[PDB]
Design a protein around this motif. Structure first.
Motif, PDB file in Angstrom:
ATOM      1  N   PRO B   1      29.958   0.798  12.663  1.00 30.45           N
ATOM      2  CA  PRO B   1      29.027   0.114  13.563  1.00 30.45           C
ATOM      3  C   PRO B   1      28.919   0.793  14.925  1.00 30.45           C
ATOM      4  O   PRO B   1      29.751   1.632  15.288  1.00 30.45           O
ATOM      5  N   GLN B   2      27.873   0.431  15.655  1.00 32.01           N
ATOM      6  CA  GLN B   2      27.718   0.829  17.046  1.00 32.01           C
ATOM      7  C   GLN B   2      27.878  -0.411  17.906  1.00 32.01           C
ATOM      8  O   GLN B   2      27.136  -1.380  17.753  1.00 32.01           O
ATOM      9  N   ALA B  67      38.754  -4.158  11.812  1.00 32.04           N
ATOM     10  CA  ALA B  67      37.333  -4.280  11.497  1.00 32.04           C
ATOM     11  C   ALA B  67      37.024  -3.651  10.138  1.00 32.04           C
ATOM     12  O   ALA B  67      36.014  -2.963   9.971  1.00 32.04           O
ATOM     13  N   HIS B  69      38.776  -1.333   8.581  1.00 32.97           N
ATOM     14  CA  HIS B  69      39.261   0.037   8.440  1.00 32.97           C
ATOM     15  C   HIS B  69      40.784   0.058   8.430  1.00 32.97           C
ATOM     16  O   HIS B  69      41.416  -0.574   9.269  1.00 32.97           O
ATOM     17  N   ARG B  87      44.307   3.853  21.605  1.00 35.12           N
ATOM     18  CA  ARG B  87      43.785   5.106  21.072  1.00 35.12           C
ATOM     19  C   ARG B  87      44.565   5.624  19.872  1.00 35.12           C
ATOM     20  O   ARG B  87      44.002   6.336  19.037  1.00 35.12           O
ATOM     21  N   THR B  91      41.806   6.390  16.973  1.00 35.69           N
ATOM     22  CA  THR B  91      41.579   7.707  16.392  1.00 35.69           C
ATOM     23  C   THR B  91      41.639   7.626  14.861  1.00 35.69           C
ATOM     24  O   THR B  91      40.842   8.261  14.167  1.00 35.69           O
ATOM     25  N   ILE B  93      40.751   5.176  12.882  1.00 31.67           N
ATOM     26  CA  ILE B  93      39.563   4.583  12.274  1.00 31.67           C
ATOM     27  C   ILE B  93      38.294   5.361  12.641  1.00 31.67           C
ATOM     28  O   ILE B  93      37.192   4.963  12.272  1.00 31.67           O
ATOM     29  N   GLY B  94      38.464   6.469  13.355  1.00 34.47           N
ATOM     30  CA  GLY B  94      37.360   7.373  13.630  1.00 34.47           C
ATOM     31  C   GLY B  94      36.482   6.945  14.789  1.00 34.47           C
ATOM     32  O   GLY B  94      35.315   7.335  14.871  1.00 34.47           O
ATOM     33  N   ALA B  95      37.042   6.162  15.704  1.00 35.39           N
ATOM     34  CA  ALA B  95      36.254   5.620  16.808  1.00 35.39           C
ATOM     35  C   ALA B  95      36.008   6.646  17.909  1.00 35.39           C
ATOM     36  O   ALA B  95      36.901   7.414  18.283  1.00 35.39           O
ATOM     37  N   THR B  96      34.781   6.654  18.423  1.00 41.38           N
ATOM     38  CA  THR B  96      34.418   7.509  19.552  1.00 41.38           C
ATOM     39  C   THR B  96      33.666   6.699  20.598  1.00 41.38           C
ATOM     40  O   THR B  96      33.124   5.633  20.295  1.00 41.38           O
ATOM     41  N   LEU B  97      33.672   7.204  21.830  1.00 49.84           N
ATOM     42  CA  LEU B  97      32.893   6.642  22.929  1.00 49.84           C
ATOM     43  C   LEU B  97      31.666   7.510  23.143  1.00 49.84           C
ATOM     44  O   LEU B  97      31.787   8.723  23.286  1.00 49.84           O
TER      45      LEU B  97
END
Ligand SMILES: CCCC[C@H](NC(=O)[C@H](C)NC(=O)[C@H](CCC(=O)O)NC(=O)[C@H](Cc1ccccc1)NC[C@H](CC(C)C)NC(=O)[C@@H](NC(=O)[C@@H](N)CCCNC(N)=[NH2+])C(C)C)C(N)=O
Lengths: 99, 99
Positions: B1-2, B67, B69, B87, B91, B93-97
């Motif tokens: 998601p975004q 969520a 993941h 973090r 990292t 779950i592949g999350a980025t900002l």
């Protein structure tokens, strides 16, 4: 940019004519900058997190450039260990979390 | 998601069979969950926030769903205002900002 989170998401900001390093912090409701002078009136506020609360000064309608992106909003100033860009200004530069 | 940041980026997590709510926190190095029982031995850690330092219990190689993941890694247990996903697991779950 797309910022990976292997390391702290630190960016350069400009506030009150000064360059500073700040942390992009999705876990902060508010923006809090290490103690400095800002133009105009302020009111006292308490903000809390891990370790408890600190007293800060609240300045409204402050412009910060965040990694080249101009934003305006409330900026708190006080004895934070790290300069923090919180959600109130992250929204203004269109920041999103993606996974 | 975004996920936009006009509200707190809260998600459902699952840990030790329990559903909990936690904050996706780019401003946290580590993952901190309010007091609960986890399997295995723990080791001591001091963590710092805006208010000062607290002692937490460090548990390694904990399985946690974030969520939807799966992550497996270090979870700190202690008195945090809000459960926070830091973090170390962001990292995984592949999350980025992004902005
Ligand atoms: C890899 C492990 C390293 C070992 C260990 N590392 C740390 O301690 C690192 C530096 N600390 C952190 O990463 C911690 C999270 C805890 C953790 O990850 O361990 N991060 C943080 O505390 C960051 C800011 C920060 C960053 C770096 C350093 C210091 C401070 N803020 C996280 C915190 C989450 C909150 C839900 C509890 N957010 C806040 O504290 C923000 N507060 C808020 O958003 C408001 N809710 C509070 C006001 C309430 N009152 C009111 N509105 N009237 C504040 C920035 C305005 C160490 N001992 O050095």
């Amino acid at each position: 940019p797309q910022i990976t989170l292997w390391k702290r998401p630190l960016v350069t900001i400009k506030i009150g004519g000064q360059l500073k390093e700040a942390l992009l912090n999705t876990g902060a409701d508010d923006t809090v900058i290490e103690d400095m002078s800002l133009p105009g009136r302020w009111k006292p506020k308490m903000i809390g997190g891990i370790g408890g609360f600190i007293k800060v000064r609240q300045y409204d309608q402050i412009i910060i450039e965040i990694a080249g992106h101009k934003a305006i909003g409330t900026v708190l100033v006080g004895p934070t260990p790290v300069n923090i860009i919180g959600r109130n200004l992250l929204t203004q530069i269109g920041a999103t979390l993606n996974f």
